[PDB]
């Protein structure tokens, strides 16, 4: 599914992401924009052989099982394919665990490079929330 901007903001807020570990909703929308362009089916291979899955590009090196990442853990206890569902529940839950891991949203390199320090409220402007 490719979410609309406000549509995704609403879903993330219903799933408890808004202000989770102190990160306003705009931070999460912005991350998703640059990770996946709001597409739950996005996948991308990393240099190390792991793969990133879903709207928040969660990686198989640590967080999900894809059967093909030798280093690996599955700390979210989830097949990576669950992260590609129309229903964002598994991506949200696993993102809550990642953002709690010590480095906050820095775990998403794209968030650090493209969202951190910017006016992330713009990403939820105009949305009924």
Domain count, the chain: 1
CATH code for position 115 = 1.10.530.10
Catalytic residue among 18, 35, 66, 119: 35
Give one DSSP letter per residue of 41-99, joined into a string: T-EEE-TTS-EEETTTTEETTTS-B-S--TT---TT-SBGGGGGSSS-HHHHHHHHHHH
Question: Which tokens belong to 14?
Answer: 């219903």
- Which of 57, 98, 56, 55 has the alpha carbon at shortest distance from 75? 98
Q: Judge whether 28 and 15 are in contact, CB under 8 Å.
A: no
Catalytic residue among 52, 66, 87, 119: 52
**66 labelled binding-site residue:** no
Catalytic (active site) residue 35: yes
| Owning domain of residue 83 | 1-129
The experimental method, as deposited, was X-ray
Cα Rg of the chain, angstroms? 14
Residue 99 exposed, middle or buried by CB count within 10 Å (0-12, 13-18, 19+): buried
- Which of 78, 117, 70 has the alpha carbon at shortest distance from 56? 78
């Amino acid at each position: 599914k490719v979410f609309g901007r406000c549509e995704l903001a609403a879903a993330m807020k219903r799933h408890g992401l808004d202000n989770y570990r102190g990160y306003s909703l705009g931070n999460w929308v912005c991350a998703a924009k640059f990770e996946s362009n709001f597409n739950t089916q996005a996948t991308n291979r990393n240099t190390d052989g792991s793969t990133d899955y879903g709207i928040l590009q969660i990686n198989s090196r640590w967080w999900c099982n894809d059967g093909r990442t030798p280093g690996s853990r599955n700390l979210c206890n989830i097949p990576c394919s669950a992260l590609l569902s129309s229903d964002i529940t598994a991506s949200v839950n696993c993102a809550k665990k990642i953002v709690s891991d010590g480095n906050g949203m820095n775990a998403w390199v794209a968030w650090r490079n493209r969202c951190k320090g910017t006016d992330v409220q713009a990403w939820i402007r105009g949305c009924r929330l």
